[PDB]
Amino acid sequence: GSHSMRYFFTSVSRPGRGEPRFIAVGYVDDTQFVRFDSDAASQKMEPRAPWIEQEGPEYWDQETRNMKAHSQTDRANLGTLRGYYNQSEDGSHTIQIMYGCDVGPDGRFLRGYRQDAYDGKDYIALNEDLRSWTAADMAAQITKRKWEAVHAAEQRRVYLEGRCVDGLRRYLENGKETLQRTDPPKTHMTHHPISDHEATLRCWALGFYPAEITLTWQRDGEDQTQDTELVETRPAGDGTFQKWAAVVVPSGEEQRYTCHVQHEGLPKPLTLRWE
Amino acid sequence: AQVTQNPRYLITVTGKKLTVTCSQNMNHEYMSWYRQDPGLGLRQIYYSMNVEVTDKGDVPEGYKVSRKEKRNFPLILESPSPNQTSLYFCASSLVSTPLPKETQYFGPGTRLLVLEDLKNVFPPEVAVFEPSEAEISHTQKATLVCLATGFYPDHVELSWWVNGKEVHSGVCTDPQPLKEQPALNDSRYALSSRLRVSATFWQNPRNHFRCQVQFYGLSENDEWTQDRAKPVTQIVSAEAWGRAD
Amino acid sequence: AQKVTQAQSSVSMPVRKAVTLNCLYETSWWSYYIFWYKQLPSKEMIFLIRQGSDEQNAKSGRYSVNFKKAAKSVALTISALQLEDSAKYFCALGDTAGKSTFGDGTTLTVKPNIQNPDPAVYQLRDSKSSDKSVCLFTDFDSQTNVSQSKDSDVYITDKCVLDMRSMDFKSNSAVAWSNKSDFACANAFNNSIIPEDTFFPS
């Protein structure tokens, strides 16, 4: 039972709307706990989960200061990337950053992540050894050489293996009642005739946490990835998630199909059949 | 690899705007200003995490800073008042949370004194006291003593120069000047220092000994309306030659 | 509260030994750093060592930190003291975004090993003048304490260690002087407890 902490930063130049927009959200596993928005009135890092509201005023002031410093460097980095790619001050552009760490069930470091994107595509990423960088194109190669000269990898790894893990443990403790939960999915099946010789079987999973889940359709034991439609796992909005998987089947063949549900909250995988 | 502060010493009158500059050419992201009152620790005024990022410390009132480029972090006192008399330190480091073997660098300090007027500023008098013949015949060593007296404020540096070269071997200087009139707040100061050499070295008449006091005082452009000489920054020295037994 | 306390204002320890300078702190910060600084008599400030709130006990050269997180105590230990370790040592707390809080410091005096003491009081006359003179109390061993003057027109400095390096020779001294007519070196250090065998020249 491993856990995660992650920060997701979005910084958007707005040519025609003044200053850029700076947004950041933090997660433990699939639960959000903080947010920042430079368009909001407070200009402050703000709580978004009940177990983080215990944190005192110096924690919020310290996080706000690191957000402000991050936003200024994203502000300068937008301009640098405009020059690298020969773009215009009239163009809107996006920098995205994800970083964080995973701990095991004992609470100790297991892996760290740091990855930057420009306009929706990989720009530069820290490799798994937290000592090495992957540059996605020639522009990112300039950044990579800069970051090798200024010990960027070590600076990230000290946080990923240190502060990151220690904060994750604190939050896992302080929000133990909710963050350690495992809600198995409640499952069911609908049936919808397409023609008078075809029908849609839909396999539903509801109210599960965490978000990761597998839904597969088998036909007489056969993996059936033929016309198997699958939607994006979605939030219920109450802390749980939903998904469904559908397959079109020949009318009267309904009982040859099975739906299999794999979730961390399930002792054994569930098999479902329209009958 | 250094942090520079300018000025290192400054005597100024209440309410006259001033700026103390701080610079480093090591491309450091992080720079911070502190003040240290006598006997206490460093109180953070403002600090800057990178270009165009500033944040207040514990005692920001009466101060402003700016961070237009990585190299400079000036401290601005819009209207200096007497309780801003202090020793000011600028510090810098490559990043705001250094790595294991990374250093925080400090500038040498700025001694700032804010006064109602400059009428009490006084350069030192310097005198060198030759070794006693009793110490010479009792120990075969010879101690010279230098005395700087009557100066205010205590903005002085004392050095010993033997045959044209600064020496530190055999030297001890009082860590702090002492007040000549401890009852008055505007008391002038005195400072002493010893240089000990061998008797044979003191007995060579070609050996030359100079005690030198660098006094940091008024600048040329400071106003002076008094009868005595304007107490500008200056060096005051006293010397002695060795003497055959 | 946000406070760093160094409870000992001064500590004195002999050369070649070890000293531990204590530091207690109160803070609501749960992710932080402790810094140790050395301030020379010149007031030059020098960073020594840093202790992370999630790290093992920091160690660097003759410096080490005994970090007791639950107690909020991060004492600094200096090994194999040298005379150049005499300074005022400061303990400080820092957060993850540039802010810091200093303690008010501990003054460390490293006392030299005076192995051939020869306490004496000497009179030294001005290189140029007819009147001016200075009294020098010198070569006492480290256990002598010079007492501040309790007479407003007599000036007496604290004791001072000089090091004749080429001779591997160390000695203490204090200086006293006055404008008074009646001022004499036999009386100069009257208010200090000085050795019984202190040489006063005949």
Binding site: H70, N77, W147, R163 | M49, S96 | -
Partner: peptide, 10 residues
Amino acid sequence: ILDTAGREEY
């Protein structure tokens, strides 16, 4: 808890 801004200029 956030990482400290630093050593991340492109």
